[PDB]
Design a protein around this ligand. Structure first.
Ligand SMILES: Cc1cc(C(=O)Nc2cc(Cl)cc(N3CCCCC3)c2)cc(C)c1OCCN
Length: 247
């Protein structure tokens, strides 16, 4: 996250921190995700497509810090790693950039909710806030494009939804942005998602309810004028989510 503020997991209790194990025993941060039910975290396919082996992954919930423990945090293996079969990537745009991780503790259990571990609601079908709505993003992504390490402490910021018409101007992203995506940005271009925030939540208040409206997906640079952050539009993937969270 460029700009915004440091935060703690109690403020974003659906946030999931996803890591990958390496030969030799090092663990690196991969991407964020969001708890959508006790057993299921939703994230972005581009985070996993090169290392699709579910055994390589560790998911934390209730975790506020990147490389140290948070009281109440819980650790999970990935029982099933589901990538979108229609995922693809062009020069800039990622398409169908959405994934599901079925989580389970080493004892075989799903998440137990607590003050620091909570589910976030899905939107209803094609139900999105109006453009100009303020929504929040959360992540362990870069604080500056020149950074080469992620921050140690979770961050959040607030961005506004941008219309498709604005986002599809040739000098923005033109037709690279589709109906299955949502753009959001800071009106002054000072705060944004960045590398490392992929897979994390774009949360908006929809009809009085905190809703997973988007998933951090792509964009050109970080907090660059006329280049919004682009998000998977969750409300256009409900049948996919429904079907893969079953058998
Ligand atoms: C959300 C976001 C993501 C990325 C980014 O690096 N994405 C990305 C895509 C893909 Cl397919 C792979 C990676 N990884 C890069 C590091 C090594 C493993 C692969 C990484 C890059 C940026 C700048 C960004 O922010 C755009 C909104 N300001």
């Amino acid at each position: 996250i460029i700009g915004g503020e440091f935060t703690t997991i109690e403020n974003q209790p659906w946030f999931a921190a996803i890591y990958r194990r390496h030969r030799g025993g090092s663990v690196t941060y991969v991407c964020g995700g969001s708890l959508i039910s006790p057993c299921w975290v939703i994230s972005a396919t581009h985070c996993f497509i090169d290392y699709p082996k579910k055994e390589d992954y560790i998911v934390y919930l209730g975790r506020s810090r990147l490389n140290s423990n948070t009281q109440g945090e819980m650790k999970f293996e990935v029982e099933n790693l589901i990538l979108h079969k229609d995922y693809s990537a062009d020069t800039l745009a990622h398409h169908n950039d959405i994934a599901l991780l079925k989580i389970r503790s080493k004892e075989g259990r799903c998440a137990q909710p607590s003050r620091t571990i909570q589910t976030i609601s899905l939107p209803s079908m094609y139900n999105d806030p109006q453009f100009g709505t303020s929504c929040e993003i959360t992540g362990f992504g870069k604080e500056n494009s020149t950074d080469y390490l992620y921050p140690e402490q979770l961050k959040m910021t607030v961005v506004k939804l941008i219309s498709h018409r604005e986002c599809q101007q040739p000098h923005y992203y033109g037709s690279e942005v589709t109906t299955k995506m949502l753009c959001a940005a800071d009106p002054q271009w000072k705060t944004d998602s960045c590398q490392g925030d992929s897979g994390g939540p774009l949360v908006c208040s929809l009809q009085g309810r905190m809703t997973l409206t988007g998933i951090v997906s792509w964009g050109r640079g970080c907090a660059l004028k006329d280049k919004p952050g682009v998000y998977t539009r969750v409300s256009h993937f409900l049948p996919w989510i429904r079907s893969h969270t079953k058998e």
